[PDB]
Structures are given as C-alpha cells and as structure tokens.
Write an enzyme that holds these catalytic residues in place. Structure first.
Site, PDB file in Angstrom:
ATOM      1  N   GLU A  71      28.300  10.191  13.111  1.00 48.42           N
ATOM      2  CA  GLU A  71      29.036  11.062  12.207  1.00 48.42           C
ATOM      3  C   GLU A  71      30.018  11.903  13.011  1.00 48.42           C
ATOM      4  OE1 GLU A  71      25.544  12.540  10.272  1.00 48.42           O
ATOM      5  OE2 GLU A  71      25.306  14.208  11.712  1.00 48.42           O
ATOM      6  N   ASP A  79      23.754  11.285  14.776  1.00 51.91           N
ATOM      7  CA  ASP A  79      24.614  12.452  14.907  1.00 51.91           C
ATOM      8  C   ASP A  79      25.942  12.076  15.547  1.00 51.91           C
ATOM      9  OD1 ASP A  79      22.376  13.655  13.950  1.00 51.91           O
ATOM     10  OD2 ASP A  79      22.019  14.943  15.697  1.00 51.91           O
ATOM     11  N   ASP A 119      29.313  14.699   9.061  1.00 50.75           N
ATOM     12  CA  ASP A 119      28.196  14.524   8.138  1.00 50.75           C
ATOM     13  C   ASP A 119      28.706  14.543   6.700  1.00 50.75           C
ATOM     14  OD1 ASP A 119      25.263  14.307   7.870  1.00 50.75           O
ATOM     15  OD2 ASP A 119      25.424  16.250   6.858  1.00 50.75           O
ATOM     16  N   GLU A 135      29.578  16.901  14.355  1.00 52.36           N
ATOM     17  CA  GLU A 135      28.611  16.181  13.536  1.00 52.36           C
ATOM     18  C   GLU A 135      28.459  16.901  12.203  1.00 52.36           C
ATOM     19  OE1 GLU A 135      24.442  16.095  13.280  1.00 52.36           O
ATOM     20  OE2 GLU A 135      24.155  17.549  14.898  1.00 52.36           O
TER      21      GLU A 135
END
Lengths: 220, 220
Positions: B110, B107, B44, B40
């Site tokens: 991503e 989360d 991100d 993540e």
RNA sequence: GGGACAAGCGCAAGGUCAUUCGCAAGAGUGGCCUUGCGCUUGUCCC
C-alpha cells in the site's frame, strides 16, 4: 423535493438524474432502488479524499497522530456538518419519523458515489469537485485539532463535566503466563460499574470505559 | 538504485522521483529518519478504493451483506501478499532489526502505490488503470470464484466441530431498552465455555458472543 | 498567565516473562509492569 436545487449547490449537473435519485432514496421508501450499494462505494471514495487531504496539510505525520484526526474526519458527526452545508436532509426520500444522522451520512457517501459514476468514474474530477466544497471545512478541523478522543479520555471529560469527579479503575484479576496474560479491570463512578478484558491493564480499562459510557447514555 | 530500477520495469511506471519509491520500501528499523509509515496510511485508503470500485462493478450480487465478505478478502493480508509476490516485493524491501513478515509486505504494498500516486502528480484516474493493468484480472477472478472471509459464527462453527464434532448453542438472555432502540443480549456456549454479546439484533448479538468465544478457544 | 489532580500520545530507563544467538563470556527481539520527562486536553484552584 427538487433534484435540481441540489445540483446547483453541488456545482455539478447530473447527466443521469436516475443516479442522484437512488443516492437519496432510502430503503423503506423504495426497497426496489435504494442507496445501499452506492453507500458502499461512496464510503471508500470519500474515505480516500479525506485521507489524501489529511496527509498533506497536517502538523505531524506519524500514524499515532493521523489516526485520531481521520477518526473524526470520517465520523458521523463531521459527515453531518458537511451534509448540512448542502441541506441534504431536505432531499432524502424516506418514510417519516425513521430518519436519523446515520442515514444522512450514508446518503452523503452514496451521493459522491453517484457523482463518481455519473462523471464516468472520473476520480481526479470528483476529487476536485469535493475540495471545491469542503477542503477548507476540512483543513479547518485539522488546523483546530479536532480528533476522536479515546474512551478513557471521553469518560473522563463526561464524569468531570457532570460531577466534577473522575472514574476509578481497579484490577480484579490477572490470568495466564507473563509473556501473554489477560487483565480484568473494573471501571466505576458513582453507582455504575462495568468490566473489561484486555491484554494489558490500560487496554482492559479502555474496555471497561467504553461500556461505562454506554451505561451513562441514559439519564441523570 | 539499480534495484529500485528493476521494480519500475515490473510495475510499468518510471519514477520521476526515485526518492519516493525508496521511502515506500524502507522500514522503520532500517531508517527512523525516513520510513514508509505515513505512506502506508495514504496507500491504505487508496488501494481500498481501487478494490471496492472494481468489486461493485464485476460482482454477481450487489447487496451489502454480499459484498462485505468479498472486500474482507480483497484487502486481506493474505490477498495483498498474493499480489505483492507478483512483483517480488520481498526482494526490494529495506529492513534492519530481525527478519521480515507478511504484514510488512502488505504495508509496503500500500505504501508503494501511495508513492506512485504522488509521484505521477496525485493523478488518481492514472494510478487506477495502472493498478488494474496488472491486478484487475487477478481480482475479478477471486470474485468470480467466490473467495470470501468467513464470519465469526461460521469460524466458531468449524472449530467446535473439528474438535468435539459438536456445535455451539446461542440463547437470548435479554432485550433491554425501548421498543424503538432495543438491544439484544445472547449467550454463546460450547461445552464449558460461555460468553455474552450485545447487539442491535439477535444475529448481531450472536456474532459478538461468537467472536469472544473464538478468542476463548483461541487460548488453548 | 502560574499551579493541583487526571487522561492520551511520544521519548527513555529499570524490572520481568518469552524467544533467538552464542568465540559461554556475553549479546539481541518481543509481551507485560513501574517510573521520569515532553506534547495535548479535561476538571479544579490562583
């Protein structure tokens, strides 16, 4: 100066000189075509490379460990060390006595934003073109252990290397219910003193510390 | 596996290493040994790129103060869910202790594309189009509409009015520092609640004082 | 190299508040406080 001397360094031949132009032109130099917008795109772009590279060649992989590094890998400081390796401060179009290191960083990002666009928004390419210049300069920072220390930590290293003394934190009040209360600590060193609100003691201290650091950023 | 074979169909990509997709759905409780944490972290910075790049292209204005609010929503926990729900991620998850939440959905979203990215062989340009294939329109619409993420002064504005039908009052208390690096200090007030805010400008100072007052009201 | 102090992070323990469960005997989750160990760093001493 020479929008071609920079191309040589970068290792990329701009097929849209106009871009590189903007990516280097500040606001007060030309409020008609500055780098602002490109900085926006460049920040997200450069952020990706840095993080994708950091997630590979890194000791530990836990969030709590990667955050401190990335904090430096994308900090204004580290962005200047990579800009200097291009002598970027010599290609910037801006009024004199107005340029600082912040602006350099923005231009740095604005730069790769331009190469990204120019090359026909070719990620993979720009990504490689990025490593072929800083990959080792980045891995090094990692291998070394460079990170962005937290406030309390910072304020400590400062106070000690200037007075060889440490800061003193003192809780002054606790409000609200237990499951959710707000703390108010007091950070003091010498004659300086600040406050800091926080869900927890430590969190309140980090706050009072951040404020003290600022206070110390004046003189001796 | 039969499940981790349905998502592939919905995604439009065949995982040559299902071991990734697995970890990109496994929570921490579910399996401390192998979770989506690290992924993540990469996803991100990767999902951010796709959005921003797309945003700077299909957007009415281009100035910074006009793109920030947008991006604030496009990478919002809210907007992320709206995209995940179009792939029923809440089904392929992998938990343990307690039930799920919207946050985790973000989360894992991503953390998902972070997998695809590495799975395809760190192919950015690829994953990019694979991302716009089933979101580009979904995003550009949010933009065309004008979906943003209201600032603090506004948020405080709406609150104070929908509870007292009155507005807050901002007063500058001081402008410390040298003329080339002056910092403003404004005071936000509403009824019997006050807060302070330090800022490079008057407005910046206010946004601060506001964000602090919202948390005061945020109390009860 | 060995330490004194301190910081951050990690692991764990105890306590507390809130919350959920409940064959009412108990059983979970989270917030906060304190402690120990580990890792890293800073100032100091050897």
């Amino acid at each position: 100066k020479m929008l071609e001397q920079l191309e040589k360094k970068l290792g990329y031949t701009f097929k849209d000189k106009s871009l590189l132009e903007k990516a280097l032109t500040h606001v007060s130099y030309s409020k008609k075509e500055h780098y602002e917008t490109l900085e926006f795109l460049g920040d997200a772009l450069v952020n990706f490379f840095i993080v994708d590279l950091l997630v590979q060649y890194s000791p530990n992989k836990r969030e709590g460990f990667l955050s401190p590094l990335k904090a430096y890998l994308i900090s204004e400081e580290f962005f200047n060390l990579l800009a200097q390796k291009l002598e970027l401060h010599k290609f910037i179009r801006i009024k004199r006595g107005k340029i600082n290191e912040t602006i350099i960083g923005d231009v740095f990002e604005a730069l790769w934003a331009a190469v990204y666009i120019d090359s026909g928004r070719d990620a993979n390419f720009t990504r490689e073109l990025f490593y072929k210049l800083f990959k080792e300069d980045i891995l090094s920072a990692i291998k070394e252990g460079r990170v962005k220390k937290d406030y309390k930590t910072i304020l400590q290293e400062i106070t000690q290397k200037r007075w060889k003394e440490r800061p003193e934190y003192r809780l002054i009040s606790v409000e609200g219910p237990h499951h959710k209360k707000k703390f108010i600590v007091e950070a003091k060193i010498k004659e300086y003193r600040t406050l800091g609100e926080g869900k927890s003691k430590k969190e309140a201290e980090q706050r009072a510390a951040e404020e003290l650091i600022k206070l110390l950023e004046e003189s001796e």
